[PDB]
């Protein structure tokens, strides 16, 4: 690995041993760890243990930010084991507002989209993380999507903004996938999902409705699916839909069971870190509802 040199910064490959004590001023800070995936580390020891772990991750490429006067404001770099290239940075309070994150982040992205021969980079910032959302924007990242997430050291889940930047954007891209479901009684299915999944009839044609759309959110666009009346008595071949939801599985589960829908049983925490339960329509279709917790 090489070193990143910026206007007034010197980004050098992370050295858990050498960098532990310096970077502990960030990792050890509760004010800084406030938005992180885990609680501030108890000691430079723990920070060493942690930093090592982060650096080990397949794909990881982390640098330690070296200020002009030696000082180490913090680190930046690409995350380990992510699929789609993830960014990450962090600074100690004492360096906030110096445009470091922006300068270091800028270096990492720039390097990644060139010498690192990558296609694009992504940054996951929590909804209220004002300071970090600013850096992202300043760096060239633009909101791509959003996702829920739960940090074990936290009371409840939270919002995550997927902000990214590409080498060259894809003119041809897909905006949504509205899968269809052939149901017996459209009007009846609509009422069920309205209740069980808090959906709302985006539109419907026919009297009674022969075809409709169920928006799973109150907005013009977003998660949703259509319905098609089955012209017959012959049982329908089930369709398996997976719904990424926000909130706690319980709250979702509860809503669904309270809705009088057919629930397979309490929510189960799968190995890929997601609690889920399935809702089965009378036609046989299966909808599994997954939440961070």
Residues forming the annotated binding site for CoA? Answer: 8, 89, 91, 96-102, 129, 131, 138
Which two structure tokens, joined as six digits, stand for 203?
A: 């539109």
Contact mark string toward ligand COA, 119..158, x via CB under 6 A: ----x-x---x-xx-xx-----------------------
Nearer to ligand COA, 59 or 97 (CB): 97
Given phi > 0 = left and psi -120 to 50 = alpha, else beta, which region is 31?
alpha
**Residue 150 near a second copy by CB under 8 A:** no
Nearer to a second copy, 1 or 173 (CB): 173
Which segment (59-67, 88-96, 159-167, 169-177) binds ligand COA by CB under 6 A? 88-96
Least Cα distance to 148 among 245, 228, 235 occurs for: 245
Residue for token digits 């002009």? 68
Site for a second copy in 191-210 (CB under 8 A): 197-199, 202-203
Least Cα distance to 291 among 281, 272, 280 occurs for: 272
State how far the Cα of 91 lies from the Cα of 100, in Å rounded to an integer.
8
Number of residues in contact with a second copy under rule CB under 8 A: 58
**Residue 120 near a second copy by CB under 8 A:** yes
Site for ligand COA in 10-39 (CB under 6 A): 32, 35
To ligand COA, the closest distance from the beta carbon of 138 in angstroms equals 6
Which two structure tokens, joined as six digits, stand for 102?
A: 């922006």
Q: What is the side-by-side strand order in the sheet with 4-5?
A: 4-5, 10-13, 61-66, 74-78, 87-91
State the DSSP code for 93. Answer: G
Binding-site member from 17, 174, 232, 265 for a second copy (CB under 8 A): 174
**Residues of 69-86 as b/e, b for ≥16 C-beta within 10 angstroms?**
eeebbbbbbbbbebeebb
Give contact residues for ligand COA (rule: CB under 6 A): 32, 35, 88-91, 96-102, 123, 125, 129, 131-132, 134-135
């Amino acid at each position: 690995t090489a070193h990143l040199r910026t206007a007034r910064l010197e980004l050098t490959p992370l050295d858990p041993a050498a960098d532990a004590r310096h970077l502990h001023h960030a990792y050890g800070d509760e004010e800084v760890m406030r938005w992180w995936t885990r609680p501030a580390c108890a000691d430079p020891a723990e920070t060493e243990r942690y930093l090592t772990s982060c650096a080990a991750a397949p794909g990881a490429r982390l640098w330690t930010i070296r200020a002009p006067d030696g000082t180490v404001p913090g680190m930046a770099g690409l995350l380990g084991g992510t699929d789609v290239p993830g960014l990450t940075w962090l600074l100690r309070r004492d360096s906030w507002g110096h445009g470091y994150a922006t300068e270091a982040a800028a270096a990492v992205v720039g390097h990644a989209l060139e010498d690192g021969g990558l296609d694009r980079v992504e940054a996951w910032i929590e909804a209220g993380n004002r300071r970090s959302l600013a850096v992202a924007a300043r760096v060239g990242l633009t909101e791509r999507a959003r996702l829920a997430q739960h940090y074990p050291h936290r009371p409840g889940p939270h919002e995550m903004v997927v902000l990214g930047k590409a080498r060259a954007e894809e003119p041809l891209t897909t905006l949504a996938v509205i899968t269809e479901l052939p149901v017996r009684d459209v009007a009846a299915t609509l009422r069920l999902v309205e209740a069980a999944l808090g959906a709302r009839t985006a539109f419907a044609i026919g009297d009674p409705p022969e075809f409709a759309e169920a928006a799973l959110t109150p907005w013009s666009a977003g998660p949703r699916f259509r319905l098609a009346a089955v012209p017959g008595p012959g049982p329908v071949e089930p369709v398996r839909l997976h719904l990424d939801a926000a909130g706690t599985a319980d709250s979702l589960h509860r809503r669904a069971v309270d809705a009088g829908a057919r629930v397979d049983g309490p929510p189960v925490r799968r190995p890929w870190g997601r609690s889920e339960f399935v809702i089965t329509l009378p036609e046989g279709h299966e909808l599994t509802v997954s939440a961070p917790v």
